[PDB]
Amino acid sequence: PPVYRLPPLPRLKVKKPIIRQEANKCLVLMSNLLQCWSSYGHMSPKCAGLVTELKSCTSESALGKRKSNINYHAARLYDRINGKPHD
Amino acid sequence: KIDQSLSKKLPKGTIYDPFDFSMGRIHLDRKYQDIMKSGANPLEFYARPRILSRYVTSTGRIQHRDITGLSAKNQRRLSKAIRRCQAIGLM
Amino acid sequence: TLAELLGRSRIAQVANNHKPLTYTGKKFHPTHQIIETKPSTLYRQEWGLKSAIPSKIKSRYLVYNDLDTLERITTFEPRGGTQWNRLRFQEMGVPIVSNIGRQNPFFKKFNTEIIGTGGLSYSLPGKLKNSPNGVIQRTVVPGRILNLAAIGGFVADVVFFQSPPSSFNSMGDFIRMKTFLFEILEASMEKNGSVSMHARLLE
Amino acid sequence: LPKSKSADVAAGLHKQTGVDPDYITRKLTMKPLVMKRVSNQTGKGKIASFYALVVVGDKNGMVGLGEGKSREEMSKAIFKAHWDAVRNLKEIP
Amino acid sequence: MKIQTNAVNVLQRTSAYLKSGLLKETPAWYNVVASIPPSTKFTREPRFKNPSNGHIIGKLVDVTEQPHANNKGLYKTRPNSSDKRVGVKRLYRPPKLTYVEDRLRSLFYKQHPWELSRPKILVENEIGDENYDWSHMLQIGRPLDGESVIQRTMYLIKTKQYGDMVEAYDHARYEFYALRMQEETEQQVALEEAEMFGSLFGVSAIEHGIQKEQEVLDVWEKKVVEETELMAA
Amino acid sequence: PYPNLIPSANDKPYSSQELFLRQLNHSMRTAKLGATISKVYYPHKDIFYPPLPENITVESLMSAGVHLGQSTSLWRSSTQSYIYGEYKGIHIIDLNQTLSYLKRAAKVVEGVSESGGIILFLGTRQGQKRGLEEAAKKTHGYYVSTRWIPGTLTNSTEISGIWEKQEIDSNDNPTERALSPNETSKQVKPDLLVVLNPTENRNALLEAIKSRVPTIAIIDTDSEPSLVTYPIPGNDDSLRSVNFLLGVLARAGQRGLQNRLARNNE
Amino acid sequence: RRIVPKLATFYSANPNHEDRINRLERLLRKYIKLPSQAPWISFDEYALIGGGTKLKPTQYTQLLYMLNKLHNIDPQLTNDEITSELSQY
Amino acid sequence: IHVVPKLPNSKALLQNGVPNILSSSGFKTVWFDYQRYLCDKLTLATAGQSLESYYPFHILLKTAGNPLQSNIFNLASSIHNNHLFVENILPSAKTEPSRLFLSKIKDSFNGSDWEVVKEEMIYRAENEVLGQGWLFLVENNEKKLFILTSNNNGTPYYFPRNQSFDLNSAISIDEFATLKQMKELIGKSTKLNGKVQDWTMPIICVNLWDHAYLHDYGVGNRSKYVKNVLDNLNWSVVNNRIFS
Ligand SMILES: [Mg+2]
């Protein structure tokens, strides 16, 4: 296969350490409720428990719950892992 | 009951390992995954759309050497053959 | 000369290969030479290779491809599972015989194909195995059903008198949890080097 | 309890690098070659710095160049240059 | 990296200092370094033999040294293109060491995959101390393996009992097989004896394996349930 | 021995401590019994019983793993003369050459120890510490395992300013008199820097050549051999080969120390 | 006579601490087989005898580990030398 | 590589054997040849393994729990047991049995005499082991001693490999119950290797293999041989391997 060797870089590091955390539960519930209220008119009792669940979630604060360290291993091992020729 | 994606079916004649039952094995398997590669100039296949259509996207575009995974010369020959094909009626 | 000593020596003895350490395809036999240390030598990170091996490795066995690479790391994997499969097979004590009518290859330009078995079993088929309870006719081995059954480091074809619903249908795709007993009938070995066992489910 | 500059230099060298102070004081004789005032444009402003470059040498084929620098007045820079020169003594053929 | 003058010319630099009077007292190392001089001759030295094979590096086969006709029946009457190019880099680049035994090793493990599963200690004991007569395979300090076979093959080749290499290899293989069978029988019978005389083994190999699998399966199950729940939501 | 051992009553069984002692006693007397095991490598034995420079062979060096150079792709061509050939995608160090350089290095180590010089063993790699300390103990010498702070010799007064200096006889007796504050502040430079990983501490080498100190180093097939006064071609990556070379050097220095002590006594 | 450094670790980063650790390490090695079955000096307290400003948290944690293990040696099997070495801390 | 240890006054032993119990030839058969053979076998078994570095006793302790590699255990057991037996035999390196040892015996065997204990041991040897084996007088974590027979290469140290009675022949109910109890205890251990704790130490090993007696005493008279061994053994050695 085609290998791709980089040039000498200043610092191997992920550009942005997106953590990729899970979406909020309260937001999901709110979206579900919105979807339900699309159908079934304005406020029918099919979404009677969903609204209650949303209220329970968003009682203390609007959202329920409130970093990736990959730099350390890349930073550490860049100089080793290089195919940089000798001094 | 459970879906197919979260259970590695060990083949009949194969060896296995304790690790092989795990989630991590399945993830590893998921991570790690022809006549033109066989060694015959693709410019024989310009009257054979069926075979040339394998090296083409659903719309009709030719696939890149990164995708198709050919020798550069062999890729260019394939491309030529495809272009010849579409110049003709067939393909 | 030095050259002669090098040719003799234990690194030259390990036959070189650049096969993948991670091979997700079908594994019918060992790919790489397993290499053990002693505990003492492990304690001071010495495996008899070019370099020291990381102190993170606490297992005594490993597999490798390159003594040293361009990345300044030996290409290895700390695992020697293949020895344990062989030892399990030996314990099971089901002698491999060629189902095709042929002479045993160990008795009597180059052929790269596998000479009989690959050396997982040098056992001969004619023996019985006595015990306090008596002469063992049926070899009892615990294994796991997948859907085929995993029986002591080998996957094996299975047969039974009646398909038991109580054990199977209660947990349809969690059959791997419950270990069942098996009666291994015989072990044949095909051209590709796969051990084709045949078991029978006991209840 | 408790020329002078040259003696102090020699003493400091003897501490740092085990060199004979008496030799440094007597046999070595120094000579400034260049004596710039030099500056850096800092956010604070233009920050001047006195740059010296001072050959020292026993007049028997033993010679050393040395450069030194001080934001404070040039005497300190010259001292540093002298120090550097004695650290870098060199037998010319 | 440039060849450093200042790492090996230490005593000269200090001798100058001592002469001057910069140094009052001589170092401890000074006399010792004078007695035992450094190399200071950092050359690229050429090599004329491959040590492993014993091939000659430097020489060139001439037109006069090849009188008879070539493959495809043409007489060499001129130097070719490669015979004119100045092959100096071959004299200096270090030789690729080749052994006949390496090929035999490769063949053996192709023929016997499960010999790879037999663990190999690479940490050498005294290489000088050993003294193996390859009249037979079973040496004392050495275990039974493909290596021993190969050594036996080489011995046979040397002695010309089997003039052909392949035949010698086969013979060595056949010697190995019998020994392996004997080893296999020894262990089984020892196990039988142990069973007979009331020995008790707490964990058998297969039982151990099953236990090992069980923990992994338990780990998988909890994870798999969570994944199914996630998929549902 | 064992003054705080509370022995169990005669009617009662053995205590845990008493049982342990019994086991120890058994181990000392009758455990190593059935056989004796000749011709086998114990790692510890290279540190505590290294061979003299004379008695070292090419075979012993090969067993140690000294012959295994860095790699074919990590080649400093400066080191070309030292290498024997390539094999298994690895340059292999000519071991007769290694031997001769080791002997030369061993002799200079012995000489400075005899003269009463300060030998300094520098070894920044992971496993090297214990063997390095042993070597430093063997000759009345010094070592560094935790990293070399740049400028220990060049900038000695700042770095090594607040540590205790000592006085010493022609023998190695402290002769504990008070060092004057002027007498204390002077630099105490090594008379032999001996490194186990010159490629990892370039700085220390540079300092040594600036500070005018002869130096010994295990030059692998990627290391610059000109950067040191006495290079020993060999395998610096494996822990046991380094220990073997280091242990030999320590033994050579030990001998020279013993000779110095003998001549002092005379 | 010769003027010479006291500690064999002299040239290392924190020489005094290293020396202190070495004695404990030696003791552990000596009594490594002795079977195993709190009020240790503070970081600041240790610094005054040990490294001072050059004392690091990791070094202190290591020292604590060394002491604790030694202390854990079953009181009946313990030595006088070990207790003397631990007395300091 | 495992090699036989150099015995004290070796040349004298070669010339004579042992004054009372073993001839020049009979001693050679038991030690100078058989022990050597055993060592060679052990070396062959454990040439390239991690076991090469370890002593026979330590090998046996490592191996005991493993069902496969029983051959190694057997060999290691034999080597250690045989050298213990030789150590017991040896004339020097007259000594009487210790006072402490006698007191321990008295405590153990209901206040019986040493001659009585010997007689009980020889009776056990006669009755228990058929074919080959070993006859130990051992001491456990409870300070009292007891007699322990093993059927070929059974170690006195580790009770699951005592190899104390033959299930090839028929067995008692009590013996079966004892076996079952042992098995249960083993299962209770709960480790990955599955190996119990045990502190049994041998005080007087005797070699009931035919390599000792058969040359001198013939196929019968094994009991007589055992008695002779008991009469004339190194007591200083025994005393040394007794106290905690
Ligand atoms: Mg290196």
Coordinates of all heavy atoms in Angstrom, one line a residue, chain F residues 70 125 199 220 222 236-237, ligand 1:
Chain F
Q70 N 22.0 -0.9 16.2 CA 20.7 -0.2 16.1 C 19.8 -0.8 15.0 O 18.9 -1.6 15.3 CB 20.8 1.3 16.0 CG 19.5 2.1 16.4 CD 19.1 1.9 17.8 OE1 19.9 2.4 18.7 NE2 17.9 1.4 18.1
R125 N 19.1 5.6 31.1 CA 18.0 4.6 30.7 C 17.4 3.9 32.0 O 18.0 4.0 33.1 CB 18.6 3.5 29.8 CG 19.0 4.0 28.4 CD 18.7 3.0 27.3 NE 19.4 3.3 26.1 CZ 19.0 4.2 25.2 NH1 18.0 5.0 25.4 NH2 19.7 4.3 24.1
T199 N 24.1 8.8 23.1 CA 23.1 9.3 22.2 C 21.9 10.1 22.9 O 21.4 11.0 22.4 CB 22.5 8.2 21.3 OG1 21.7 8.8 20.2 CG2 21.6 7.2 22.0
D220 N 26.8 2.8 19.8 CA 25.9 1.9 19.0 C 26.1 2.3 17.6 O 26.8 3.2 17.2 CB 24.5 2.0 19.5 CG 23.6 0.8 19.3 OD1 24.1 -0.3 19.2 OD2 22.4 1.0 19.1
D222 N 24.1 3.8 15.7 CA 23.5 5.1 15.4 C 24.2 6.3 16.1 O 23.9 7.5 15.8 CB 22.0 5.2 15.7 CG 21.7 5.1 17.2 OD1 22.2 4.2 17.8 OD2 21.0 6.0 17.6
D236 N 23.9 -0.6 23.1 CA 23.5 0.2 24.2 C 22.0 0.1 24.6 O 21.7 0.5 25.7 CB 23.9 1.7 24.0 CG 23.1 2.4 22.9 OD1 22.5 1.7 22.1 OD2 23.2 3.6 22.8
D237 N 21.2 -0.5 23.8 CA 19.8 -0.6 24.0 C 19.4 -1.7 25.0 O 18.6 -1.4 26.0 CB 19.0 -0.7 22.7 CG 19.0 0.5 21.9 OD1 20.0 0.8 21.2 OD2 17.9 1.2 21.8
Ligands
MG1 MG 20.7 3.2 20.6

